[PDB]
C-alpha cells in the first residue's frame, strides 16, 4: 500500500460490529475522512477476521460521506451497517 492512497475494503460483519475503534470529534470540511482509529476492538471483526490494522482511516462508510461527520456519527454508522461493509479507508500518514 501506498501513503495518502484510495482503496476499497469489503467485509463481512460477524459480531454484529465491524469491528474498529475510531475517535477524534467535530470537523470544519478539512480533513476528507475526518476520522482516525486511534485503537481497535478485540471483539469481532477484526481481530480474529483481521484485514483492519491501526493507522488507516475510515471516510466512505457504505456511500457515508465524512467529510464532516461527528464521532458519535461515524461510529454509530460503522456498526449500524449491513451484511456488507463496502467502506473505502485511506493510508493515514501518521508521522509521529
Same mark, same amino acid.
Given at each position: 500500500? +501506498?501513503?495518502?492512497?484510495?482503496?476499497?475494503v469489503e467485509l463481512? +460483519? *460477524?459480531? *454484529? $460490529?465491524?469491528?474498529? $475503534?475510531?475517535?477524534?470529534?467535530? *470537523? =470544519? /470540511?478539512?480533513?476528507?475522512?475526518?476520522?482516525?482509529?486511534?485503537?481497535?476492538?478485540?471483539?469481532?471483526?477484526?481481530? $480474529?477476521?483481521?484485514?483492519?490494522?491501526?493507522?488507516?482511516?475510515? @471516510?466512505?462508510? *457504505?456511500?457515508? $460521506? @465524512?467529510?464532516?461527520?461527528?464521532?458519535?456519527?461515524?461510529?454509530?454508522? @460503522?456498526?449500524?451497517?449491513?451484511?456488507v461493509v463496502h467502506?473505502?479507508?485511506?493510508?493515514?500518514? /501518521?508521522? =509521529?
Amino acid at each position: 500500500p +501506498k501513503p495518502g492512497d484510495i482503496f476499497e475494503v469489503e467485509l463481512a +460483519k *460477524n459480531d *454484529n $460490529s465491524l469491528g474498529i $475503534s475510531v475517535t477524534g470529534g467535530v *470537523n =470544519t /470540511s478539512v480533513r476528507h475522512g475526518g476520522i482516525y482509529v486511534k485503537a481497535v476492538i478485540p471483539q469481532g471483526a477484526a481481530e $480474529s477476521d483481521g484485514r483492519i490494522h491501526k493507522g488507516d482511516r475510515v @471516510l466512505a462508510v *457504505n456511500g457515508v $460521506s @465524512l467529510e464532516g461527520a461527528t464521532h458519535k456519527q461515524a461510529v454509530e454508522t @460503522l456498526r449500524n451497517t449491513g451484511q456488507v461493509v463496502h467502506l473505502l479507508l485511506e493510508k493515514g500518514q /501518521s508521522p =509521529t
